[PDB]
Paper text:
AppA, the Escherichia coli periplasmic phytase of clade 2 of the histidine phosphatase (HP2) family, has been well-characterized and successfully engineered for use as an animal feed supplement. HP2Ps catalyse the hydrolysis of phytate via an obligatory phosphohistidine intermediate.
While the wild-type enzyme has a strong preference for 1D-6-phytase activity, a marked reduction in stereospecificity was observed for a D304E variant, while a proton donor-less mutant (D304A) displayed exclusive 1D-1/3-phytase activity. Notably, KM was 5-fold lower than wild type for the proton donor-less AppA-HAT variant and the MINPP-like AppA-HAE double mutant. On the other hand, action of the AppA-HAT variant revealed a reversal of stereospecificity from the wild-type enzyme generating InsP5 [1/3-OH] equivalent to 89% of the total InsP5s. Turning first to variants bearing mutations at position 304, substitution of the proton donor residue with an alanine (AppA-HAT) leads to an increase in volume of specificity pockets A and B and a shift of the inhibitor (rmsd 0.5 Å for carbons of the inositol ring) towards pocket B. A modest shift is also observed in the conformations of the sidechains of pocket B residues, His250 and Phe254. This variant shows a marked change in stereospecificity displaying almost exclusive ID-1/3-phytase activity. Indeed, this provides evidence for an intrinsic role played by the proton donor residue itself in determining the stereospecificity of the enzyme. In the absence of further evidence, the increased size of pocket B following the D304A mutation may point to an enhanced 1-phytase activity of this proton donor-less variant. Why for this variant the inhibitor binds with the 1D-6-sulfate in specificity pocket A rather than the 1D-1- or 1D-3-sulfate as suggested by the results of HPLC analysis is unclear; however, we note that a previous crystallographic study of a variant AppA resulted in a similar phenomenon.
Author numbering: 5 to 410
The structure:
Amino acid sequence: ELKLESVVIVSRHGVRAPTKATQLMQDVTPDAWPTWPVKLGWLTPRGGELIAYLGHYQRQRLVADGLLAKKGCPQSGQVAIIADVDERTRKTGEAFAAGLAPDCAITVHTQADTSSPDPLFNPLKTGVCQLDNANVTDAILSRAGGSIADFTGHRQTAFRELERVLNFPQSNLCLKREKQDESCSLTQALPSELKVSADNVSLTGAVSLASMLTEIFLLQQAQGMPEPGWGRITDSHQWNTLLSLHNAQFYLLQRTPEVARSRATPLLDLIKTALTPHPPQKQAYGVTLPTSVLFIAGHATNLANLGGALELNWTLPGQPDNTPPGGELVFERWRRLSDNSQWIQVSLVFQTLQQMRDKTPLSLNTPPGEVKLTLAGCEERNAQGMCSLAGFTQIVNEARIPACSL
């Protein structure tokens, strides 16, 4: 019924070491954090291997869909790869190429200067545009339930689960409060406030600490470390409860449209140019678009910003982190043969946490997880839930913030 014509994959980098090692992380647990085999924030060898599995799966699937050849290397830009300048994203691009097309040396393009941020992955970071402070503040606080106190008050069960995993009552932070005849809970020892500036939003205190620590536990598990969370995370309900704090921070800081639309604008522009039929032309990064497959190696924030800007909702069965390492927001252009009309499908492809833990090789018989998505604002849908190319184009043009384009 339909023929696949083009694919654009926006991927988070693979498993990485923690980005920070703070005094506060030391003070909230009596136990020692496991050390990592690479520098802060770098991709681990295992993370690259897990990304290569997704590349191998994508080759098999795209061959089955008739888009790539079964053997040989894709020719003359048929596959293109763009990566953010960070080590973890560049190495993810290389790992994906290695799995998709081994020994084909597909180029991993970055911006010219790899020592400075690339605004494609966040235009706020280079001052291309600025957030509206008042509108962002109100929108985030409303989505929090009206206040950060309301947000944390509804999540006490999850904070107590994190405290149990940390052995928080025996930590230096708690023991000093016990000497001050004070009880000890994460949220009240570390009050959380929303900080909004023209270039960034963040939360302080227990909310941001919890988001980062629960991701670390997930990374330990995906890395194959013997005892993530000191052996105190023993079932899937516990994993899901812990990562709910991480996903909740992303819901506030990265999915809120007042942030997401600006932050995702350059990616929206690149995705739409990649998906729109047009005479092929070399554009950003020296990549000729449109082409058959474009893989973009970015960050969890990019996935969440695109989801919020495009009204794409998901949770990932078997994967506690909604923006997991190697997770892929996959945009596809399909041609309907009955009338040769053009349609856009979006899905979220991901390894389950068990597939990461077991280092499961992926294939058509053992595929990654996949959640089919819908663009909530699409008014022209087909029976398969896809949006017409015209409807997708209208959604993107409404979502994007012109001042944030490159």
